[PDB]
Motif scaffolding. Structure first.
Motif, PDB file in Angstrom:
ATOM      1  N   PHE A 180       0.849  -1.184   0.000  1.00 53.42           N
ATOM      2  CA  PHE A 180       0.000   0.000   0.000  1.00 53.42           C
ATOM      3  C   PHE A 180       0.891   1.242   0.000  1.00 53.42           C
ATOM      4  N   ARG A 201      11.658  -2.635   9.958  1.00 54.24           N
ATOM      5  CA  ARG A 201      11.374  -4.055  10.160  1.00 54.24           C
ATOM      6  C   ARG A 201      12.599  -4.914   9.835  1.00 54.24           C
ATOM      7  N   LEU A 204      13.348  -7.393  12.596  1.00 53.03           N
ATOM      8  CA  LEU A 204      12.403  -8.504  12.445  1.00 53.03           C
ATOM      9  C   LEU A 204      12.827  -9.413  11.280  1.00 53.03           C
ATOM     10  N   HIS A 207      15.542 -11.727  12.397  1.00 52.30           N
ATOM     11  CA  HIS A 207      14.865 -12.794  13.147  1.00 52.30           C
ATOM     12  C   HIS A 207      14.298 -13.881  12.214  1.00 52.30           C
TER      13      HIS A 207
ATOM     14  N   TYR B  17      -0.601  -2.251  18.904  1.00 56.46           N
ATOM     15  CA  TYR B  17       0.778  -1.777  18.763  1.00 56.46           C
ATOM     16  C   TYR B  17       1.201  -1.033  20.021  1.00 56.46           C
ATOM     17  N   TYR B  64      -2.242  -6.087   6.034  1.00 46.75           N
ATOM     18  CA  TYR B  64      -0.838  -6.002   6.414  1.00 46.75           C
ATOM     19  C   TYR B  64      -0.678  -5.989   7.938  1.00 46.75           C
ATOM     20  N   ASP B  68       1.522  -8.471  10.249  1.00 45.09           N
ATOM     21  CA  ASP B  68       2.658  -7.926  11.004  1.00 45.09           C
ATOM     22  C   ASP B  68       2.563  -8.325  12.481  1.00 45.09           C
ATOM     23  N   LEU B  71       3.534 -11.885  13.009  1.00 49.73           N
ATOM     24  CA  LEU B  71       4.983 -12.036  13.072  1.00 49.73           C
ATOM     25  C   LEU B  71       5.571 -11.504  14.383  1.00 49.73           C
ATOM     26  N   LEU B  72       5.117 -10.328  14.806  1.00 53.05           N
ATOM     27  CA  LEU B  72       5.696  -9.692  15.991  1.00 53.05           C
ATOM     28  C   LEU B  72       5.434 -10.483  17.267  1.00 53.05           C
ATOM     29  N   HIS B  74       5.812 -13.579  17.881  1.00 55.33           N
ATOM     30  CA  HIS B  74       6.968 -14.425  18.193  1.00 55.33           C
ATOM     31  C   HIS B  74       8.244 -13.632  18.438  1.00 55.33           C
ATOM     32  N   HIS B  75       8.451 -12.583  17.650  1.00 55.41           N
ATOM     33  CA  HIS B  75       9.670 -11.787  17.770  1.00 55.41           C
ATOM     34  C   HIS B  75       9.740 -11.089  19.127  1.00 55.41           C
ATOM     35  N   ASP B 200       8.128   0.495  17.108  1.00 54.31           N
ATOM     36  CA  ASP B 200       9.316   0.113  16.355  1.00 54.31           C
ATOM     37  C   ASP B 200      10.363   1.228  16.341  1.00 54.31           C
TER      38      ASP B 200
END
Ligand SMILES: CCCCCCSC[C@H](NC(=O)CC[C@H]([NH3+])C(=O)O)C(=O)NCC(=O)O
Ligand SMILES: CCCCCCSC[C@H](NC(=O)CC[C@H]([NH3+])C(=O)O)C(=O)NCC(=O)O
Lengths: 220, 220
Positions: A180, A201, A204, A207, B17, B64, B68, B71-72, B74-75, B200
């Protein structure tokens, strides 16, 4: 040690955050076990396709971006400078010719693409110079180490079907990956595909790749 | 030793977030030389003030963001979970009572604010339990370690103009620091104030403070 992981970076030299992401990945490209593929794209096409609009147009966001980049300049050691004139002016001028030129480079001398891209960003996002005029693009290209003859020839192909279509197709690949806006980073790892947005990112990404994050300026 | 740097974190439990940035700052608050100050805020007031809209409203962004956060999870090791279309549901219901409760906690028992906030996020963004009903908020408060009596006494105060106004003022303070969304983190260092948007920007925060970044899960 296994085979390298392909990582695609879709970017536009109009985008300041694309430059930051680009430099971090370039700094890691021979440290991590990756195959970095640079994908010159048009933010204009991505915005149209997604129905999104440039964040910087919202005044609260534009003000914040100027603050953020001023700090990131020092953190990442990239000489990014917010333009003296309003963003809308640079945005309105756009980057179509520059991104077409980078496409022609990718088609004929991809080994020059990293440097040609960096030199264009150095114009628009460092020294606040034009990137729309033929002479401006040639200047960046010669800075990148391209002979005048070489640069002239590529510039001549900016409006050819081959170049126009390649830029359109790269831009639509980004859209198909779910873009986007830019930059996006697409990592193909352990049989899965992950699309990451923005310049923030990369830790990440490290990772996901099982690599070590050493900050935005890894030691050489 | 130099005086700790004040770091203000503006957040809403409606925002996943915000939870991520909160957990990162909480992990560093006894490692870095900082005084972390939690500032319960309302994302809806910030959207209004800035003329911004919730990003998830754009389908491609919503998708998205969903990817995201997955994913985050686990990170960052944060047990986030949600069903399809959850943000659409959270938007409707809101977090007004929850955020007013946290405001009352901040006014009378700020030392309980971290755990109370964490428990509310666990309800909405891990177990996907209600946070609008009085019984729901009291359940989180008791899980956080408050006695039934303390919790009910604080919940009674969300009916008061002082609490209602304080939440509004804190939310306005976020806007005056430049907020167009949450979380924002405001660092007061070397006589200067820096506002950072997002979960972030903590590595950049470490840079600004001259502290060592050890990733989102620093070692003990
Ligand atoms: C000519 C000046 C234009 C400047 C625009 C900013 S770069 C484009 C912009 N990218 C970002 O906002 C990236 C921000 C991200 N936090 C990062 O750190 O990289 C975008 O496509 N945003 C998409 C979106 O937020 O919806
Ligand atoms: C499953 C969908 C989840 C949606 C969560 C929305 S939380 C609120 C939202 N916050 C963010 O987008 C922060 C993103 C940032 N990249 C981060 O990592 O923290 C906001 O105020 N955004 C302001 C803006 O983007 O304009």
């Amino acid at each position: 040690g296994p085979l390298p992981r392909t990582v695609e970076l879709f970017y536009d030299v109009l985008s300041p955050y694309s430059w930051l992401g680009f430099e971090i990945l370039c700094r890691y490209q021979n440290i991590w076990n990756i195959n970095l593929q640079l994908r010159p794209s048009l933010i204009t096409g991505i915005m149209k396709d997604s129905g999104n609009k440039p964040p910087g147009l919202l005044p609260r966001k534009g003000l914040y971006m100027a603050n953020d980049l001023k700090l990131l300049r020092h953190h990442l050691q990239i000489p990014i400078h917010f333009p003296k004139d309003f963003l809308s002016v640079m945005l309105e001028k756009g980057s179509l010719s520059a991104m077409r030129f980078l496409t022609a480079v990718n088609l004929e001398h991809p080994e020059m693409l990293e440097k040609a891209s960096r030199e264009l960003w150095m114009r628009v996002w460092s020294r606040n110079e034009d990137i729309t005029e033929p002479q401006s693009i040639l200047a960046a290209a010669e800075k990148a180490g391209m002979s005048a003859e070489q640069a002239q020839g590529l510039l001549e192909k900016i409006a050819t079907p081959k170049v126009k279509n390649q830029l359109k197709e790269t831009t639509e690949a980004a859209c198909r990956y779910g873009a986007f806006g830019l930059p996006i980073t697409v990592a193909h790892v352990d049989g899965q595909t992950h699309m990451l947005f923005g310049s923030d990112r990369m830790e990440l990404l490290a990772h996901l790749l099982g690599e070590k994050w050493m900050g935005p300026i890894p030691p050489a």
